């Protein structure tokens, strides 16, 4: 689990979205595994607007933060799951690291702020859904 809270927006993994997230839907993209819903309270997370390829992510399955080097956002093929059939997921960055399904939602941060959230894994690689291109989260 895990979400990004900025302004009157809440960003979650689309596969983990609640009934309330869907009832207050702002935008969703199945290909990115992202869903943004509206909130009453104001959020204070700062979104990075950069092209950093190094950062730190939170891994609940180990109760630890790990420094990582990650790839640039791209179309990477993701094996079938109970949430989606086999497809290419867009805007995805990979890093050598540990992850488990329950780690989805953990934030990846660089020195500029929030970069994205944990979204895929397997084969000793962790996938992060990038959020830096969503400039509308700040206005
Ligand atoms: C963080 N994490 C996620 C996973 C693992 N860690 C390890 C096992 C694979 C699993 C995974 O890659 N998927 C299951 C959840 C939905 C994902 C998606 N966005 O399409 C695909
Ligand atoms: Zn950065």
From Swiss-Prot:
Zn(2+) 1 binds at residues 50, 52, 110, 112. The active site is at residues 15, 33, 104. The chain holds residues 869 to 1007 of 2193 of the full protein. It comes from Coxsackievirus A16 (strain G-10). It comes from the Viruses. Homodimer. Disulfide bonds: none annotated. Cysteine protease that cleaves viral polyprotein and specific host proteins. It is responsible for the autocatalytic cleavage between the P1 and P2 regions, which is the first cleavage occurring in the polyprotein. Also cleaves the host translation initiation factor EIF4G1, in order to shut down the capped cellular mRNA translation. Inhibits the host nucleus-cytoplasm protein and RNA trafficking by cleaving host members of the nuclear pores. Counteracts stress granule formation probably by antagonizing its assembly or promoting its dissassembly. It catalyses: Selective cleavage of Tyr-|-Gly bond in the picornavirus polyprotein. This is Protease 2A.
């Amino acid at each position: 689990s895990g979400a990004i809270y900025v302004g009157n927006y809440r960003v979650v993994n689309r596969h983990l979205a609640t009934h309330n997230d869907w009832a207050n839907l702002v935008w969703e993209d199945s290909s990115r595994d992202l869903l943004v819903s509206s909130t009453t309270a104001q959020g204070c997370d700062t979104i990075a607007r950069c092209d950093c390829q190094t950062g730190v992510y939170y891994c609940s399955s180990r109760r630890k933060h790990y420094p990582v080097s990650f790839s640039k956002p791209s179309l990477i093929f993701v094996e079938a799951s109970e949430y989606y059939p086999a497809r290419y997921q867009s805007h995805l960055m990979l890093a050598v690291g540990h992850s488990e399904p329950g780690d989805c939602g953990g934030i990846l941060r660089c020195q500029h702020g929030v970069v994205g959230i944990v979204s895929t894994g397997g084969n000793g690689l962790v996938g992060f859904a990038d959020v830096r291109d969503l400039l509308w989260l700040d206005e």
